[PDB]
């Protein structure tokens, strides 16, 4: 139970840090972020970003070769959901 949370918090801490050491963007982007699921870099607007499924997932050894996707709008804004929350395509990563 908790152990999952602990691995998850580990993942977050690690991308909050991983992302400090980054150069400023040279173009219109979507600010880097931890959307509570995966760690995203600065992504150019109107493009879709990819990531290997996050490792805190219990089945990460079976989806290690899979990807999670997040769309960055032409706006320079990541696409949000129905209620405005962090949004993404993790179908590949689901059980």
């Amino acid at each position, epitope marked *: 139970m908790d152990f999952l949370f602990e691995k998850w918090k580990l993942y977050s801490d690690q991308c909050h840090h991983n992302l400090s050491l980054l150069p400023p963007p040279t173009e219109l982007v979507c600010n880097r972020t931890f959307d509570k699921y995966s760690c995203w870099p600065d992504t150019p607007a109107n493009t879709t970003a990819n990531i290997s499924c996050p490792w805190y997932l219990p089945w990460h050894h079976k989806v290690q070769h899979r990807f999670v996707f997040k769309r960055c709008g032409p706006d320079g804004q990541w696409v949000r959901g129905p209620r*405005g929350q962090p949004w993404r395509d993790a179908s590949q990563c689901q059980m």
Partner: antibody, heavy 128, light 108 residues
Framework: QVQLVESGGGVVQPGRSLRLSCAAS????????MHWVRQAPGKGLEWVAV????????DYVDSVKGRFTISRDNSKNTLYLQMNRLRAEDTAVYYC?????????????????????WGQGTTVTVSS | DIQMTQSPSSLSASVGDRVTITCRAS??????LGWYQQKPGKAPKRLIY???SLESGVPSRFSGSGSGTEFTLTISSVQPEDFVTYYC?????????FGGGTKVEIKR
């Protein structure tokens, strides 16, 4: 006794600004999303604004976009509603409501449970 | 923008009647919906949550039903204090939307 208490209502001239407040008690204010709902005198209910923890997830009903600002002070468990460039349609009773959400780690989905607790309300009358 | 068509705007009842209030959502909203009662001069008070769940401390005569696009609020036998306004609220998508409301009036 979980409660919400609103203050700051009154008479304000069109064009001018008002600040509303919603004091909370009986619960941990930070762990919840807060809403504002208003009701013109003889009319029904209309959702106005909503914030969260971050608060990077603020939404407003179209008619108040760029005019109202919602904010919260977690140090003092209080919700605010900045009302600027007021006009006739803003005349109403304003309630504040509480809503619980839930983040699933495994699925990465966010679940919302709707508005469960309101305040007594506070009246805003726009007039010269 | 999800529309909540509520019916009827006002109805007529004698204590003991069964009252049925319908709410039709323009978009599938799964079960993210609640019914509200508002007594005159007072703030709304949720009765049904998650479409069919009953808030704790509410009479057993109130029941909600439906999912997706069609929802229903029922009062098995209207009571004297129940003759007041009722609202449905959708929390599926921003902005949040209410039905027009139903004013339940006692008949003579």
């Amino acid at each position: 006794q979980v409660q919400l208490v609103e203050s700051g209502g009154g008479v304000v001239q069109p064009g001018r600004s008002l600040r509303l407040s919603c004091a909370a008690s009986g619960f941990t204010f930070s762990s919840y999303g807060m809403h504002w709902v208003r009701q013109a005198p003889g009319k029904g209910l209309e959702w106005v604004a909503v914030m969260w923890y971050d608060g990077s997830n603020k939404d407003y009903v179209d008619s108040v976009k760029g005019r109202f600002t919602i904010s919260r002070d977690n140090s003092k468990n209080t919700l605010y509603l900045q009302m600027n460039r007021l006009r006739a349609e803003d005349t109403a009773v304003y309630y504040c409501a509480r809503e619980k959400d839930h983040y699933d780690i495994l699925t990465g989905y966010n679940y919302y449970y709707g508005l469960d607790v309101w305040g007594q309300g506070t009246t805003v009358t726009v007039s010269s | 923008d999800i529309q909540m068509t509520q019916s009827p705007s006002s109805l007529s009842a004698s204590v003991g009647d069964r009252v049925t209030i319908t709410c039709r959502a323009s978009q599938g909203i799964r079960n993210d919906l609640g019914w509200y009662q508002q007594k005159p001069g007072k703030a709304p008070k949720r009765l049904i949550y998650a479409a069919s769940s009953l808030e704790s401390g509410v009479p057993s005569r109130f029941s909600g039903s439906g999912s997706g696009t069609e929802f229903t609020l029922t009062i098995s036998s209207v009571q004297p204090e129940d003759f007041v306004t009722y609202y449905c609220l959708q929390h599926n998508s921003n902005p949040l939307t209410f039905g027009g409301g139903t004013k339940v009036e006692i008949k003579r």
